């Protein structure tokens, strides 16, 4: 069954074996079609560790369509604990924005508010404005300015 043969593929990614669980995706992406498996990636990006999500996306992230995931929060989670911003980062804050999840964005903000590098807080910053935020969005961009950005410094300037 496709969706046993998908639990395998999950345990062996969420352990690491990332070679191992994505050739097993791989088959099934050959032998079903895309409004059948799309699921599965949702499903793991609930719960892989940070430390291999960056992974599994980089190899099979364009086998599924994310913007049909509701969870995307988690990897902009993993881009924060990863301290990391990368492609697959922006692109779930894209989505999370054309979502309308003010909520999940807004999370994300408290929780940087601190570690997180200056890109990181500019990212959130101005996906927040685009949802409404204005007032968390400037808080993290003053942070931003804080830390050394630039161009941050000069936004907080014209607010």
């Given at each position: 069954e496709i969706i046993r043969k998908l639990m395998d593929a999950k345990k062996f990614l969420l352990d690491g074996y990332i070679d191992e669980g994505v050739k097993i995706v791989l088959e099934i992406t050959k032998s079903s079609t895309k409004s059948e498996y799309n699921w599965f990636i949702c499903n793991l990006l609930e719960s892989i560790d940070c430390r291999y999500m960056f992974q599994v996306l980089d190899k099979?992230?364009?086998?599924?369509?994310?913007?049909?995931?509701?969870?995307?929060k988690s990897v902009v989670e993993c881009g924060v604990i990863n301290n990391t911003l990368n492609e697959h980062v922006n692109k779930a804050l894209d989505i999370l924005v054309i979502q309308g999840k003010r909520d999940k964005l807004e999370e994300i903000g408290r929780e940087i508010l601190?570690?997180?590098?200056a890109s990181i807080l500019v990212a959130i910053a101005n996906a927040l404005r685009r949802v409404g935020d204005e007032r968390d969005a400037t808080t993290l961009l003053i942070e931003a300015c804080k830390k050394g950005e630039k161009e941050a410094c000069n936004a907080v300037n014209t607010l």
């Open positions: 099979i992230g364009s086998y599924f369509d994310l913007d049909k995931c509701q969870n995307l601190n570690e997180v590098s």
